[PDB]
Design an enzyme around this catalytic site. Structure first.
Site, PDB file in Angstrom:
ATOM      1  N   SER A 245       0.753  -1.239   0.000  1.00 44.27           N
ATOM      2  CA  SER A 245       0.000   0.000   0.000  1.00 44.27           C
ATOM      3  C   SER A 245       0.792   1.304   0.000  1.00 44.27           C
ATOM      4  O   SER A 245       0.217   2.368  -0.210  1.00 44.27           O
ATOM      5  CB  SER A 245      -0.968   0.023   1.166  1.00 44.27           C
TER       6      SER A 245
HETATM    7  C1  LIG Z   1      -1.597  -2.276   1.814  1.00 41.64           C
HETATM    8  O1  LIG Z   1      -0.492  -2.532   2.253  1.00 41.64           O
HETATM    9  C2  LIG Z   1      -2.813  -3.068   2.136  1.00 41.64           C
HETATM   10  N1  LIG Z   1      -2.439  -4.369   2.671  1.00 41.64           N
HETATM   11  C3  LIG Z   1      -3.271  -5.419   2.680  1.00 41.64           C
HETATM   12  O2  LIG Z   1      -4.371  -5.320   2.240  1.00 41.64           O
HETATM   13  C4  LIG Z   1      -2.842  -6.748   3.188  1.00 41.64           C
HETATM   14  C5  LIG Z   1      -3.058  -7.824   2.201  1.00 41.64           C
HETATM   15  O3  LIG Z   1      -2.468  -7.709   1.104  1.00 41.64           O
HETATM   16  O4  LIG Z   1      -3.816  -8.749   2.527  1.00 41.64           O
HETATM   17  C6  LIG Z   1      -3.162  -7.061   4.614  1.00 41.64           C
HETATM   18  C7  LIG Z   1      -4.486  -6.928   5.070  1.00 41.64           C
HETATM   19  C8  LIG Z   1      -4.556  -7.236   6.434  1.00 41.64           C
HETATM   20  S1  LIG Z   1      -2.990  -7.597   7.045  1.00 41.64           S
HETATM   21  C9  LIG Z   1      -2.178  -7.396   5.527  1.00 41.64           C
HETATM   22  O5  LIG Z   1      -3.469  -3.191   0.897  1.00 41.64           O
HETATM   23  C10 LIG Z   1      -2.872  -3.858  -0.201  1.00 41.64           C
HETATM   24  C11 LIG Z   1      -3.706  -2.198   3.047  1.00 41.64           C
HETATM   25  N2  LIG Z   1      -2.814  -1.207   3.717  1.00 41.64           N
HETATM   26  C12 LIG Z   1      -2.553  -1.689   5.081  1.00 41.64           C
HETATM   27  C13 LIG Z   1      -1.912  -0.586   5.873  1.00 41.64           C
HETATM   28  O6  LIG Z   1      -2.166   0.606   5.626  1.00 41.64           O
HETATM   29  O7  LIG Z   1      -1.111  -0.923   6.744  1.00 41.64           O
HETATM   30  C14 LIG Z   1      -3.859  -2.244   5.698  1.00 41.64           C
HETATM   31  C15 LIG Z   1      -4.768  -1.153   6.259  1.00 41.64           C
HETATM   32  C16 LIG Z   1      -3.607  -3.230   6.827  1.00 41.64           C
HETATM   33  S2  LIG Z   1      -4.646  -3.040   4.322  1.00 41.64           S
END
Ligand SMILES: *C(=O)[C@](NC(=O)[C@H](C(=O)O)c1ccsc1)(OC)[C@@H]1N[C@@H](C(=O)O)C(C)(C)S1
Length: 502
Positions: A245
């Site tokens: 992200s």
């Molecule tokens: C970006 O890093 C993020 N990550 C995820 O969605 C994760 C995944 O790929 O499954 C994840 C979800 C729960 S634990 C790891 O999207 C691609 C989002 N950004 C993260 C952040 O800001 O730290 C989130 C809010 C945990 S989800």
């Protein structure tokens, strides 16, 4: 009977300092002892005292001389102090000789081990700056003519045929004060979160200079007896990762530049998932319907960024990422530096379009990520990276339009300051901006990337913490607090005036 031969005159390796002239690598005079066996064989009653002076077994020492009684040269030991050097010289053994050589000491030790690097047994660079600038630092060696008899006894020093040229002084872009702050705060985050590894990079957005580069685990480069190799990895430059992200702002940059999106435009993200055939996009928080583009970054909606990605095309996102240097050569010429990969597909299916937009299906380094954020903070102008002090800043390349970079900067300030944002990245007295990430490699990478002050950005920073185990794993709670604490100190050390004013 009498033969002319040439002996190399070792040269003093150039001083490495930080940007403020603090010493990071110094050449120390050492004494190396070599021997002519053919001469030693005429004075065997002296051997035992010499073996003991070299802490060797008398039988093993004797066995080695006898075994090499045909040769005219062997090393006895390399790199004694001159005090312990004199001890052995005093023993007055026929066929023992001395070479005056140089040994690196690293005053800051483990605090800047990866960045400064290490020399091999021949005083050549092997990791980090020592390796990258070995030609600058090394210094061409000398040549002296000696006469030898047929037993290889050195009769006479004749002359110097080539003067030793000392290596040249090199000032790093690293600021030791920031390097120590980053080192302390990353170590403490590692221990607080029971994490396997991490990196933290600090960059000057205006000059492209790396002010700090630190990794855990680290090592004392003055202790040449352990060399645990996993601790020798300069992770910021050689460990690649899916950035997840932390690349959504570059997706948002493509969206704003497409002519199809403004910040107040809305995406319906209900119900917080989206089926893409076999793939299912999931938001962590799914209590959303209409989000504006800012909201999509505050809640890090993968549904929202994906729908924007489908509208504008993967090509425009790929383009922004390529231009800010994700998966791209840094130009630093550090051998073994990792470039990662930003795969350029012609057309992208929907799955690959979504995963690109939220930072999967590309590999980057902490240094590339920091550089990318630097370009965003520097009103969309990428300044070339440097690990050496920059006197005259080279021209940057406008990679995002200033209006778009300015707008995305403002959105990332809201990611940090807004209701439901990454409050742990707040930097009391300053406006800070950034984006959290949490990446699957169950095993997680905790990321935060950002810059400050938002009003006139000076510093870009990246925090990567590998496999936190103790207290959750969200970037927003594991890495954001480190960004906060290191940015709090770095800004004040650089006398950046607080911008959280009326
Ligand atoms: C970006 O890093 C993020 N990550 C995820 O969605 C994760 C995944 O790929 O499954 C994840 C979800 C729960 S634990 C790891 O999207 C691609 C989002 N950004 C993260 C952040 O800001 O730290 C989130 C809010 C945990 S989800």
């Amino acid at each position: 009977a009498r033969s002319v031969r040439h002996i190399a005159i070792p040269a003093h390796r150039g001083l490495i300092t930080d940007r403020n002239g603090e010493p990071l690598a110094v050449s120390t005079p050492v004494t190396t002892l070599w021997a002519n066996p053919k001469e030693l064989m005429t004075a065997k009653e002296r051997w035992p005292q010499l073996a003991a002076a070299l802490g060797q077994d008398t039988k093993l020492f004797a066995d080695r001389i006898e075994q090499n009684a045909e040769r005219e040269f062997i090393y006895l030991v390399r790199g004694l102090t001159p005090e312990q050097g004199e001890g052995v010289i005093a023993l007055k053994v026929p066929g023992v000789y001395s070479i005056e050589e140089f040994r690196r000491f690293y005053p800051a030790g483990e605090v800047v081990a990866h960045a400064v690097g290490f020399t091999d047994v021949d005083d050549r660079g092997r990791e980090g700056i020592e390796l990258a600038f070995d030609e600058w630092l090394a210094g061409v060696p000398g040549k002296r003519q000696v006469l030898k008899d047929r037993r290889g006894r050195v009769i006479k020093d004749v002359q110097v045929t080539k003067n030793a040229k000392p290596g040249k002084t090199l000032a790093l872009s690293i600021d030791l004060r920031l390097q120590y702050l980053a080192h302390r705060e990353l170590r403490n985050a590692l221990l607080e979160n029971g994490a396997k590894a991490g990196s933290l990079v600090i960059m000057d957005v205006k000059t492209g200079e790396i002010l700090a580069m630190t990794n855990q685990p680290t090592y004392n480069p003055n202790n040449r007896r352990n060399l645990q190799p996993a601790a020798m990895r300069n992770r910021a430059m050689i460990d690649v990762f899916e950035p997840g992200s932390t690349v959504k702002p570059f997706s948002m940059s493509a969206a704003l530049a497409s002519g199809r999106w403004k910040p107040s435009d809305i995406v319906d993200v209900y119900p917080g998932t989206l089926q893409i055939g076999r793939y299912t996009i999931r938001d962590v928080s799914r209590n959303s319907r209409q989000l504006d583009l800012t909201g999509i970054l505050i809640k890090s909606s993968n549904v929202g960024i994906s729908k924007i990605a489908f509208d504008i095309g993967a090509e425009s996102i790929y383009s922004v990422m390529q231009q800010v240097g994700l998966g791209q050569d840094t130009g630093l010429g550090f051998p073994g530096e990792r470039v990662g990969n930003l795969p350029n597909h012609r057309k992208w299916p929907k799955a690959e379009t979504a995963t690109l937009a939220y930072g999967y299906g590309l590999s980057v380094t902490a240094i590339q990520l920091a550089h990318a954020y630097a370009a965003l903070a520097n009103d969309g102008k990428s300044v070339p990276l440097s690990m050496t002090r920059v006197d005259r800043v080279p021209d940057g390349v406008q990679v995002i339009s200033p209006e778009v970079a300015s707008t995305v900067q403002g959105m990332l300030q809201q990611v940090v300051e807004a209701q439901g944002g990454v409050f742990r990245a707040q930097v009391p007295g300053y406006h800070a901006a950034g984006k959290s990430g949490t990446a699957r490699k169950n095993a997680y990478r905790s990321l935060f990337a950002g810059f400050a002050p938002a009003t006139d950005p000076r510093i870009a920073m990246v925090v990567v913490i590998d496999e936190p185990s103790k207290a959750g794993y969200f970037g927003g709670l594991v890495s954001a607090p480190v960004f906060s604490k290191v940015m709090a100190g770095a800004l004040r050390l650089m006398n950046v005036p607080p911008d959280n004013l009326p």
